[PDB]
Task: inverse folding
């Protein structure tokens, strides 16, 4: 919609802002059911296709016994725990029969379970009605039985190669018409209904299908859908690249890299920080993330982009000497960390080189630039529309005396480096 | 069984014990074969479906030319080497003919290869017999040929998008009736037969299907199954979380995290340590692991849970400054590392917040607890039955003088930190 | 060719040389199109099979709205950025019509887009021609009309299913997205050199794995997706694989021991006067003696980095090392043997199938060739060695860790080098020496 991006020459980092949040805060668990039947050449094909039915039920029975930079700081939880709790209820006596009763006259029904969870239950395939009413005979019957048995066969195979938990949720587990109607009857706000409906493919990837139970001639599996409790708050993506001195002797050079790269989103007076930005999915200017992949930081962490030396937040950096050249493709441009004898250029679609990077950390916007070359690596830039702003600044690495600079600090900060410099300075005195 | 769990307040860690081992120590390689045939509307549908057959054989021929926290300490090996060694033998002249001979009158046959490996060979589809007997014509025949060609096409498609090696092994590569009979005829003990048969889904997940050879009208691929040479020894899971001081100035705070978290299992007088606990699969109270993902440690490593300062094992720790809050969901509870201004609570579904964590490292059991909230993240606890024991203790981080404490140590130990403190204390004097 | 391997006892590392390069340096974007149609008991099967057609089109419209050791030193890029840029062009007005017009008389056609990118457009399935000619029934003469519609609709349903469970980006590219006959002709009509044509054709399975299929657009009754194929700008240059393992002292007190590991392990290939270094060797795929890598997973280093295997103390390149104390035993299975780092009380052996244990590794770092060796055991872990034919050379040498004073040796250095360790030792030695 309106994406902007600022590059900070002083800290060799860039922030892409203008995005809107869609953060997964809750789960909606629904129970999907398939009603099963206990049981010339046109008849031989029927028994062969019926053996597929009996082998799929055996697999599901034999599968039901299988009960369901700063990223290392993250917590540890189970993503499907709320879906497992619903599945544990279905194993209670008379609970599957409660679902079987509510879907007797209709396909969509809201069922309140014995543990108080009111789930929205679906009957998506009626194979007991088909197989039992067409059990009288034992080519038109052969083809239509393969079409109705196909969904059961594919649901079973997806569960077989995924321990009974699949993500993203396929059209076999839940069709678009079923998912769209499930969203409409879902007890959520109108903003969440419009968001999930306009992005059903993202909803599928952040959803789970959990194989549950097959008893009393009923196959039931749990589809666990994301609930976005945070919508339309500001998000911004922080890109970082190593910032080194560019002296002629490489042994006297020191480096510094901001380690707080990832996705940031405003959330409930704090900031939700996703250190491994691969765990978020971007749709135009909407970013979908799971709060399980996040750290909760003070909102003052944003100040590191403006003044990395601010007294309100201890900005995190590393000081590993990384004297090799690399590039980071941002949202609207490219950061280039060019060091040593590496050839660092930016080229245009048809004409070739239009910018030659010198040693140090620099930036080029994607306007009129299509590729970036660093050594023998060719990078294509993102061609999304948006404005880039180059914030000139003295590289902060030039403020440090190399003789007392603490190199090889893995997870440090501005204050930690300041503290270690004083100790070394004390030894000098 | 009876899962118990101890939380150690002194080192911010918890051990879940009561599990039984099932460690992959060996491989069983079997050769799966499909006998192939060399080569109006009822005739046009056949020839287009015959083009699918010729395109799958071409694909498999074109695929046969494709010859088959502490986790960074692990070794490097090839998981499929034992299956590849069998596949290299099948390319010798007359070796495929021996298998074709032993499967001439039956589907199950044990063949001793030219390298001395007595493999259990299967003929799972006799497609040469079908195409040759129904080669006379050149609608009932069209449908039965789609059913007869379906398994060959799906085996080819799984190999095409997996470089000829698939895991888990699908029901197309090996059906349940074939897998169960393969287990029964497998030269193993009755205890291992019952374990694999009661856990076929885990066996599939820890198995490989290796595309091998397609010559002399025979398609042959190797299914490599796990052998659990370590069964029913004690296992326990170690959870760790950062332990920091809680002084009023955040710059004067120091942290410490046990780095030895993961799965531990007794094995042959030593302990098999799996540093990335994601590489193990837990079924009720049995834990399935592959010894390739393990380090072999002295059994005295258990002493770190009772006395982290013991003289018999140098317990491993890190000292990265962790000013962030997080939680670890254990087997019977939750560890909460709460620092700064973060809201850290444990709530009940209907009763609300029942524990408010203060700054530091603490623990809550799952008894009466449903969720744990740390900042903007909600964690669900396991509702598994079991007793938790809270071992009160002074957090060991309080024993260290912050002025000589070595922060930012990535892979340290109790002795290494003591050594750097002595050196720094020596420099001062 | 001839795979050889040298083990350097001094640095606990081994180099496997004799490989030939096939490096992904660029991307080629092609546009694959499917022409679509805007629309008794045997009549129920057709419309039920026709509901699958409209449900696949609904998915694709609803999917088109979703527009897409030293490895931490690597850069960060978008792998499909070049294909997304081509797809962004197809969303322009009248751009699909240029493709729709150019594919009117043929299936293979080169189309010049409005921004000058000359893409190679392909039409692989004509479903508008079939549905329009068989639109008369909408009552059906025979069942054969149902079966041929299941056969003609099968590829569209499977392309949609692969896109549905992959956000519209699939890799490797399946035979549904592009068949072998289509890929081989796409390779032949691809404007590349004859060496690159022969390389891709004899290795189509690798080409599929290093390719992307990007769902793009559904407009004007045309389904179009972009298949992004690898361009191998570096072929047949020498490559070599470097294996490393921890090198520690074996003193009687386990607390007085220090360790050192070469961190520059990975794949190396000569490339344009420099060396392309792939620190995570899992990102390369080896076919016999040819190695396929992506330059996006590489660093461009001076060629003097090779000197670290012969003289780790050379003045021309600062060889990279770590000094984390790794008091555990481990093994690395190389191309023609095995490196074993054995420490403490661990049992470390190499055995034969029939002859038994033939080498027992002692504390420290050692190496055994695959000649007569079938397995390597370290503790409770069994590793199988490569049975490939080739010569191993054991380069005797004093382990360099014995050259360091343990009392001033800087342990727990995550990403250091020979000079960085020397500089930290001097500072500690200077403080001691001034006293
Ligand atoms: C340590 O150095 C930093 C550098 O800015 C300074 O702010 C701080 O006061 C110093 N502290 C001591 C004890 O020298
Ligand atoms: C090293 O530290 C330990 C524990 O702090 C202490 O027992 C020992 O005496 C120290 N060594 C020296 C030489 O001071
Ligand atoms: C640093 O150590 C090297 C030997 O490793 C020596 O040649 C050099 O003079 C030292 N520099 C000092 C002590 O300043």
Result:
């Amino acid at each position: 919609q309106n994406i902007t991006e600022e590059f900070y020459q002083s800290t060799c980092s860039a922030v892409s802002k203008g995005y809107l949040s869609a953060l997964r805060t809750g789960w909606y668990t629904s129970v999907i059911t398939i009603e099963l039947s206990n049981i010339d050449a046109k008849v031989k094909l029927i028994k062969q296709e019926l053996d597929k039915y009996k082998n799929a039920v055996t697999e599901l029975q034999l599968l039901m016994q299988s009960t369901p930079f700063l990223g290392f700081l993250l917590g540890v939880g189970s993503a499907i725990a709320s879906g497992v709790a619903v599945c544990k209820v279905l194993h209670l006596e008379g609970e599957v029969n409660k679902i079987k009763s509510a879907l007797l006259s209709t396909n969509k029904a809201v069922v309140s379970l014995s543990n108080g969870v009111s789930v929205l239950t679906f009957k998506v395939l009626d194979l007991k009605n088909y197989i039992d009413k067409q059990l009288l005979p034992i080519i038109e019957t052969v083809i239509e039985f393969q079409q109705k048995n196909n969904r059961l066969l594919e649901i079973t195979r997806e569960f077989s190669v995924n321990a009974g938990v699949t993500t993203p949720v396929s059209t076999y587990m839940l069709t678009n018409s079923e998912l769209l109607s499930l969203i409409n009857d879902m007890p959520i706000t109108n903003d969440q209904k419009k968001l999930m409906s306009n992005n059903v493919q993202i909803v599928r990837q952040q959803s789970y299908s959990i194989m549950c139970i097959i008893k009393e001639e009923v196959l039931a599996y749990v589809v666990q859908l994301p609930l976005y409790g945070v919508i339309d708050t500001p998000c911004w993506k922080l890109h970082t690249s190593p910032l080194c001195t560019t002296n002629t002797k490489e042994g006297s050079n020191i480096c510094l890299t901001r380690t707080d790269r990832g996705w940031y989103c405003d959330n409930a007076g704090s900031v939700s920080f996703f250190p491994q930005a691969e765990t978020c999915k971007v749709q135009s200017n909407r970013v979908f993330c799971d709060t399980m992949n996040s750290l909760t930081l003070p909102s003052e962490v944003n100040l590191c982009n403006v003044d990395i030396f601010n007294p309100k937040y201890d900005c995190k950096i590393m000081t590993l000497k990384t004297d090799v050249s690399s590039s980071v493709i941002t949202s609207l441009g490219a950061i280039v960390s060019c060091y040593g004898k590496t050839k660092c250029t930016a080229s245009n679609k048809n004409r070739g080189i239009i910018k030659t990077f010198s040693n140090g950390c620099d930036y080029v916007s994607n306007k009129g630039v299509d590729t970036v070359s660093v050594g023998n690596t060719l990078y294509y830039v993102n061609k999304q529309e948006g404005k880039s702003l180059y914030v000139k600044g003295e590289p902060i690495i030039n403020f440090y005396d190399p003789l007392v600079f603490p190199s090889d600090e893995f997870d440090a900060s501005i204050s930690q480096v300041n503290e270690k410099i004083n100790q070394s300075l004390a030894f000098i005195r």
In short: The first strand of chain C starts at residue 4 and ends at 8. Residues 254 and 429 of chain C are 23 Å apart (CA to CA). Chain C touches chain A through 63 residues (CB under 8 Å).
